[PDB]
Symmetry: C2
Subunit: 200 residues, 2 copies
């Protein structure tokens, strides 16, 4: 075991680093990376179950940490596999496109690409920065549809199957930071001003 | 599309039939089968989305049917992949071992093998038949442990991580069929009789 776990982790961790070095744009390679990310969790989970506090002088996480990371790896592996079976399969996909960091940025649980900043001024440049995305992949059990990140006076949203879904509502930050609920949105084009009447 | 979906389904369905013909005992092949089962759902889902009521004169299911089947294929694909990364990977695994029929038999959500009948007589041979399993694979996010199906006066159970879990409780059938709550369990060895006092 000791040896067996060490050798398995070493092989697993070498594959992960090789993916990092190569920086491929082929979706197939990203699938294999996330499968290795998932396998690493199974190795640490077993090491922890066996009572090891380190493997090769590297900390072995608690079981709950390894379970949670394997769930994250699974979500990414599955998503990429659904994309692999769709019409979007042959696009360019970068490692950062398929990273957990992107995946969890609003809108959470979605691979996304071609991100850019939208800035909201809550009175004169409290000024917040938010990421919008031209390509948002909505993956379900047997399908995927790419939608575009759109920008409102009210926030950032997409429209999927007819349904407009806001993933950022600018009023949330305004009520947390500012005194007035009136702002100006800059997103790479005409500033967006409040479209309704403003009062006393 | 029409052509594209037809050709994809034809290729997908030929692979599924080839797995059926070959009858392998290698876990790797069962992984590939369930990936094709999942892909078939994505093809039918797209066909239905596109308004086709049949593809090649075969009925296209409603979307909800294809979504539900892809979830089932995913659960089996993931399970087999967790087994592939464990110490049980090189055992024999049959197509029936990895079938949805087995997977959903109590205890549900578990690949299992080496099943046999236990018979319970609710007074003199209402006589019920239940399947018990010598090998039950409890798969979680980053691990799998094989447990054995065990037999009680009370039912069928396994013990996982110290916790005894009944997957069949014989009192459920007795209260649904019989007048007295006293039975005799036959499971391939000594009959099991009621172990407590019986009353007026």
């Amino acid at each position: 075991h000791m040896e067996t776990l060490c050798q398995r982790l070493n092989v697993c961790q070498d594959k992960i680093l090789t993916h990092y070095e190569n920086d491929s744009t082929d979706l197939r390679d990203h699938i294999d990376y996330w499968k290795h990310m998932r396998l690493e969790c199974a190795i640490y989970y077993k090491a922890r179950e066996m009572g090891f506090k380190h493997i090769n002088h590297q900390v072995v996480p608690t079981l709950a940490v390894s379970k949670n990371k394997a769930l994250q790896a699974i979500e990414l592996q599955l998503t990429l596999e659904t994309i692999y079976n769709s019409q979007y399969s042959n696009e360019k996909w970068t490692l950062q496109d398929v990273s957990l960091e992107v995946y969890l940025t609003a809108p959470t649980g979605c691979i996304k690409k071609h991100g850019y900043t939208v800035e909201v001024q809550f009175d004169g440049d409290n000024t917040m920065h938010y990421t919008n995305w031209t390509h948002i992949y909505i993956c379900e059990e047997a399908s995927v549809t790419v939608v575009e990140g759109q920008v409102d006076y009210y926030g950032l949203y997409y429209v999927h199957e007819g349904i407009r879904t806001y993933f950022v509502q600018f009023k949330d930050d305004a009520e947390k930071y500012s005194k007035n609920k009136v702002w100006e949105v800059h997103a790479g084009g005409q500033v967006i001003l409040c479209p309704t009447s403003v009062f006393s």
